[PDB]
Amino acid sequence: GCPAEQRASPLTSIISAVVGILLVVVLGVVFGILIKRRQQKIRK
Amino acid sequence: EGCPTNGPKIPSIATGMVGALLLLLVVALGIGLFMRRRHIVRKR
């Protein structure tokens, strides 16, 4: 079953968002460099 | 006066993780659909 409803703890919304942006940034550079290596050599 | 009605009891902080995941999926869907709306595909 899913967790009951809520309507408090505004600090939870912030942490969630921070993770979303931080995740996209890391995955963005990681995934990009992960695929690039397959294309061609960029690091000399 | 009294009757705190509890507070720190799951669910509570767990919302943080769910928020990060949900947002990630929500954003990915919005960015992917908007970027695809212009028939801009990386590979077919």
Contact by Cβ (8 Å): A17, B23:
yes
Contact by Cβ (8 Å): B5, A8:
no
Main-chain phi, psi angles of B9, to 5 degrees: -150, 120
Alpha-carbon distance A15 to A27, whole Å?
18
User: How far away is chain A from the Cα of B15, in angstroms, using its nearest Cα?
Assistant: 7
- CA A35 from centroid of its chain's CA atoms: 17
Location of structure tokens 């928020």: B19
Q: Which among A19, A22, A27, A38 is the top mutation candidate for probing chain B, defined by the most B β-carbons within 10 Å of its own β-carbon?
A: A19
* CATH number of the structural domain B14-36: 1.20.5.420
Location of structure tokens 């990060």: B20
Say which experimental method was used.
NMR
Contact by Cβ (8 Å): B15, A6:
yes
Question: Would you call B19 and A12 a contact, using CB atoms and an 8 Å cutoff?
Answer: yes
Location of structure tokens 């659909």: B33
CB-based contacts of A30, cutoff 8 Å, min separation 6: none
CATH number at residue A38: 1.20.5.100
Count of domains for chain A: 1
Confirm or reject contact between B25 and chain A (CB < 8 A).
Answer: no
Residue B31 in tokens: 């960015």
Confirm or reject contact between A20 and chain B (CB < 8 A).
Answer: yes
